[PDB]
């Protein structure tokens, strides 16, 4: 599924991400836009042989199991394919664990390079929340 901007904002808010660990909803929408263009089916391969999955591009070296990343961890205890569903619950629940792991949202490279320090509130402008 390819989400609309306000549709995704409302879904993330319903799942408890607004101000989770101090990160306003606009941060999460901005990260999703530049990680996946709001597409739950997005995948991308990393140089080390791991793969990033879903709307928040969660990496298989650490967070999920895809059966082809030798010597990787599965810290969210889920198949990576679960992160590609039209239902974002699995991606959101894993993201909560990632952002609590010490480095905050700096775990998302596109957030650090394209959202951090910008007016992220503009990503939820006009939405009924
Ligand atoms: C969205 C996504 O998948 N992002 C990936 C990043 O998570 C990943 O960065 C590495 O993440 C691990 C796990 O969070 C980091 O290890 C943690 O580091 C903190 C302090 O730095 C420490 O307190 C934790 O105990 C430790 N956890 C474990 C299990 O060891 C690791 O430092 C991150 N590395 C870097 C360079 O940021 C990166 C790199 O694999 O990929 C993203 O796609
Ligand atoms: Cl915001
Ligand atoms: Cl933080
Ligand atoms: Na893994």
UniProtKB/Swiss-Prot annotation:
Residues 1-129 form the C-type lysozyme domain. Disulfide bonds join 6-127, 30-115, 64-80, 76-94. One of its GO terms (cellular component) is extracellular space. It catalyses: Hydrolysis of (1->4)-beta-linkages between N-acetylmuramic acid and N-acetyl-D-glucosamine residues in a peptidoglycan and between N-acetyl-D-glucosamine residues in chitodextrins. Its EC number is 3.2.1.17. In the egg white and polymorphonuclear leukocytes. Substrate binds at residue 101. One of its GO terms (biological process) is defense response to bacterium. GO terms for molecular function: beta-N-acetylglucosaminidase activity; identical protein binding; lysozyme activity. Coiled coil: none annotated. Its main location: secreted. It is an enzyme of class 3 (hydrolase). PROSITE patterns: GLYCOSYL_HYDROL_F22_1, GLYCOSYL_HYDROL_F22_2. It holds the Pfam family Lys. Keywords: Allergen, Antimicrobial, Bacteriolytic enzyme, Disulfide bond, Glycosidase, Hydrolase, Secreted, Signal. It is found in: Secreted. The keyword Phosphoprotein does not apply. Lysozymes have primarily a bacteriolytic function; those in tissues and body fluids are associated with the monocyte-macrophage system and enhance the activity of immunoagents. Has bacteriolytic activity against M.luteus. Belongs to the glycosyl hydrolase 22 family. Lysozyme C is capable of both hydrolysis and transglycosylation; it also shows a slight esterase activity. It acts rapidly on both peptide-substituted and unsubstituted peptidoglycan, and slowly on chitin oligosaccharides. Monomer. This is Lysozyme C. It comes from Gallus gallus (Chicken).
């Amino acid at each position: 599924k390819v989400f609309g901007r306000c549709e995704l904002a409302a879904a993330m808010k319903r799942h408890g991400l607004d101000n989770y660990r101090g990160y306003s909803l606009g941060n999460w929408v901005c990260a999703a836009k530049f990680e996946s263009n709001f597409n739950t089916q997005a995948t991308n391969r990393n140089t080390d042989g791991s793969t990033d999955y879903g709307i928040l591009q969660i990496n298989s070296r650490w967070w999920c199991n895809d059966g082809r990343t030798p010597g990787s961890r599965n810290l969210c205890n889920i198949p990576c394919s679960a992160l590609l569903s039209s239902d974002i619950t699995a991606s959101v629940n894993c993201a909560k664990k990632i952002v609590s792991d010490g480095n905050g949202m700096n775990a998302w490279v596109a957030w650090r390079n394209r959202c951090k320090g910008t007016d992220v509130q503009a990503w939820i402008r006009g939405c009924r929340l």
